[PDB]
């Protein structure tokens, strides 16, 4: 059989604490912070944008193939934060489930249904005796047909929820505060009061201005509902638009 449930309140996954709180799940949350990367996702009423750091602590590494923006299906894209291997495995799971949904139901899977499926799968890990929660949280975006632009977020606990604008990573709580002040204040965010909002959030919470090599942007818009990763030039264009005033 298996190694056995490690004896202890926080030793194992399914064991319950005296006031009924799973611990390995919360350690999985605190495993997101490994890597130092943080991600921000916001949506206007006709576009959804995900922005993340691209920290490459070396120059031998092929910067082109290092990334965190993965395309689940042609209309759905995600940004993963946390331990990389689990993130990529969950991307595989997402791609498989989204293709299977289209095969079985004949139309593109809505973002909510995909996020719900993956939350369901991830919760199962929080109930058996050797599976382990994937230390990585997903942030999906997309346009279904009419429900509007949507930005969702999974988590190792299996929870998921709707967001007008969200963030994940290390510098997450402060990003949440800044983004809450953003949404409180003014919420057209057509396409520009968008991404300048996300880049401004990421910078103001993180450090001084980014330069186009450290930023990875994917967008979906109502009249262009396909996941496009912005190239190094147009990201730089938005960067000067920050500087240009």
């Amino acid at each position: 059989m298996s190694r056995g449930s490690s004896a202890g309140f926080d030793r194992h996954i399914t064991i319950f604490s005296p006031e009924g709180r799973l611990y390995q799940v919360e350690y999985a949350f605190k495993a997101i912070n490994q890597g130092g990367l943080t991600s921000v996702a916001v949506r206007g009423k006709d576009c959804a944008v995900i922005v993340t750091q691209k920290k490459v602590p070396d120059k031998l590494l092929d910067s082109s193939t290092v990334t965190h923006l993965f395309k689940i299906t042609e209309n759905i894209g995600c940004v993963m934060t946390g331990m990389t291997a689990d993130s990529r495995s969950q991307v595989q799971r997402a791609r498989y489930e989204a293709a299977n949904w289209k095969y079985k139901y004949g139309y593109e899977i809505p973002v909510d249904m995909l996020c719900k499926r993956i939350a369901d799968i991830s919760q199962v890990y929080t109930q058996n005796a050797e599976m382990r929660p994937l230390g990585c949280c997903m942030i999906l975006i997309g346009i279904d047909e009419e429900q509007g632009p949507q930005v969702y977020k999974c988590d190792p606990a299996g929870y998921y929820c709707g967001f007008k604008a969200t963030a994940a990573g290390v510098k997450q709580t402060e990003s949440t505060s800044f983004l809450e002040k953003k949404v409180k204040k003014k919420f057209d965010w057509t396409f520009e009061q968008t991404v300048e909002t996300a880049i401004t959030c990421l910078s103001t919470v993180l450090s001084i201005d980014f330069k186009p090599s450290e930023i990875e942007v994917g967008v979906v818009t109502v009249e262009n509902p396909k996941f496009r990763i912005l190239t190094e030039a147009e990201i730089d264009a938005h960067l000067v638009a920050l500087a240009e005033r």
Binding site: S2, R3, S6, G8, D10, R11, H12, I13, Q24, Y27, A28, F29, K30, A31, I32, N33, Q34, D58, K59, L60, L61, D62, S64, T65, V66, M83, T84, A85, D86, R88, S89, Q92, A129, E130, M131, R132, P133, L134, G135
Partner: protein, 239 residues
Amino acid sequence: TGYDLSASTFSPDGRVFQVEYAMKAVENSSTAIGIRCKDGVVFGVEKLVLSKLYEEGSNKRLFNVDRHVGMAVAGLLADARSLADIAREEASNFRSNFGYNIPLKHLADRVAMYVHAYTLYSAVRPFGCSFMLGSYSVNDGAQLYMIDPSGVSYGYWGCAIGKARQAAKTEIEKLQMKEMTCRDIVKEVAKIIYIVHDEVKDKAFELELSWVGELTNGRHEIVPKDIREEAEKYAKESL
């Protein structure tokens, strides 16, 4: 402490220790470097001759996983050899299902997820090795990918895994590998290997080369010997 007896256990600060011992396990094995240049990728290992009784060619670490794909490992020989065998099956399956050769970027993702899939169960233990997949094809040029025991798969211009990866990376950073050919890169590879090697503890090693790329019609091969001696010499006068 106490949170490091199984892969299905998160430490209170959020670190799966029984994959970080494995990533710290490869530092027990000798180094292995692979450099990507204009025409192809060339490997090279500080292969240890454990005793003079061994045949010239025992404990190979430069397995061929497919016609156009190479592999250089570091860590437990048994587990690395098993992963080489597993990759040999991915290439075969891809060829049988889709007719053409398996893309390197896809193969490195087929296997990395496998190494990862052993890193989240209490029954099995993580693989204790890291390896580099190298390939070349006229369609996509030369690619090089590395897979740590944790399952993280990234592509590299220059890579080095083993007990002295740091010195090897420092010395690799001194080449313009994007602007060179394998013919001129093998010499530099031998130079790096002798520079990084620590002789005091590890006398009697066997430098072991391999390249695949344009000059070999994109087929993985151990380096023809006379080139191996010219590189051996070149590394020697430099030292």
